């Protein structure tokens, strides 16, 4: 089997991407944030505190003939950005782009933090990291991808995120028409539950490439590119007037600037992030100070290849017995 779904930016800055997901019988379609940095499939639901719902589409398990309460199971998750959610658990039929899993754990939110409430366009998350991070207790549950894996033509999914435009998540096959040149594969460590890999270095604009190992995670659920402070300083030093602002919470730059590209290494290959991808616009409406898309990972504890980086590539998440990551230009 295979699946193929379109993923769409939630706003004009590509802050996140939503992908339609069918849950239950008859289908209830929710728009979920596919997140390769976590491993819970959770949804706004009929059980969510009413004051914490503001425009989201909710899953109503009582209206699904295939929904079954997973007796005794609860979940609770906190994310890197400080947001959180929790609730109880159903199993139900879940389909993504024609690919169907029966008995998928669907985690029903009773509580969500304000950040989720305020984002009316995101109805939940669909985790695509390794199932070892799944927070369901007392019986840990598998991700959609883990459940689908044995049925897939090939045990892979791919992320093809668009810049200010729709893109694609595919399951079970590699679309050889979706990228240019070759795919370069690189080793993955699952020791922390993430798609963790080591970049071979970087360049700023037309500058020389610096060979240096950068350990980080491929995370579709993080907006920006978070790298070591040395790297990030070298980038923003090439932008006149750029500075790190503690009051704003990162690097800002004059909105009149033209940003340089940023290149990262995948083995001997190179992925080029165009400068425009690094512009996240005015810090506040009407401001002439703009927020940078490359930020320091210092104090996160890990480097994160988020959407800013991933959308410059066709990315293969290979879930074979020995997982790997592949990157191609497109």
Swiss-Prot record:
It comes from the Eukaryota. One of its GO terms (molecular function) is aspartic-type endopeptidase activity. The keyword Electron transport does not apply. The keyword Transmembrane helix does not apply. Residues 17-328 form the Peptidase A1 domain. Its EC number is 3.4.23.22. Disulfide bonds join 255-290. One of its GO terms (biological process) is proteolysis. It catalyses: Hydrolysis of proteins with specificity similar to that of pepsin A, prefers hydrophobic residues at P1 and P1', but does not cleave 14-Ala-|-Leu-15 in the B chain of insulin or Z-Glu-Tyr. Clots milk. The active site is at residues 35, 199. Keywords: Aspartyl protease, Disulfide bond, Hydrolase, Protease, Signal, Zymogen. Belongs to the peptidase A1 family. This is Endothiapepsin. It comes from Cryphonectria parasitica (Chestnut blight fungus). The lineage of its organism: Eukaryota, Fungi, Dikarya, Ascomycota, Pezizomycotina. The chain holds residues 90 to 419 of 419 of the full protein.
